[PDB]
Amino acid sequence: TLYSKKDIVQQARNLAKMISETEEVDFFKRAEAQINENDKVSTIVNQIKALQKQAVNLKHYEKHEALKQVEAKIDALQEELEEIPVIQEFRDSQMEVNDLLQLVAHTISNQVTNEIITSTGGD
Amino acid sequence: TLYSKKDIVQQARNLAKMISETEEVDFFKRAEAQINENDKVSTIVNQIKALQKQAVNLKHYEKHEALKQVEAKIDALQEELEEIPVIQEFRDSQMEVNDLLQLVAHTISNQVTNEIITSTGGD
């Protein structure tokens, strides 16, 4: 009997659980732990939050010129955030995990095509 | 010990082999067999081929007006091709397989995030 879509979904979840037990995701997890504890990241994320609250207010009241300044402040803070060591580590771990996922997707896609070819021969 | 990228790739290939043994891919395979044997599809695909050969020639010699006619002929034939029953079946099977693959990708992506959350808690 053929695998049902339901079987495949369960098997895909099993693959994901193993993917979550790779050095890549292990890196992402400890990196994430470090940015949740870093004080500088906390200070900056809060300031950004506060400014985004003002932004919504300024646009409501159509304070365009004032909005531009708040937006400049947010851009300034976001770039500062990315300069932070633990943030750089986090971004690096994110990429490692996203690249791994893409590899899995390509592998699955390419293997399916191979299996279909070996079974049919292509059209 | 954590799974290595290599382990994951192998496991992804195993998932693909099972995916290739679903009703979806089984549908794609018998649909593909039918268009490779259909005479009308063969006639049209060959005519399209021949015209694409003329197209390359016309553009080389810069026969723009003439190229436009050859391109119109190709469009006419392609649409005729899609009207063919066995082709409609093939397109339907292709979608079933592509939708299944997308589901697998989403499932893997969403389960990884869940596993990371249950292990860390998110950032």
UniProtKB/Swiss-Prot annotation, chains A, B:
InterPro entries: Bact_com_dev_regulator (IPR052767), Biofilm_formation_YmcA (IPR016783), Com_YlbF (IPR010368), YheA/YmcA-like_dom_sf (IPR023378)
A Pfam family recorded for this sequence: Com_YlbF
Chain's role: May work together with YlbF to regulate community development.
Protein name as annotated: Uncharacterized protein YmcA
Upper lineage: Bacteria, Bacillati, Bacillota, Bacilli, Bacillales
Gene: ymcA
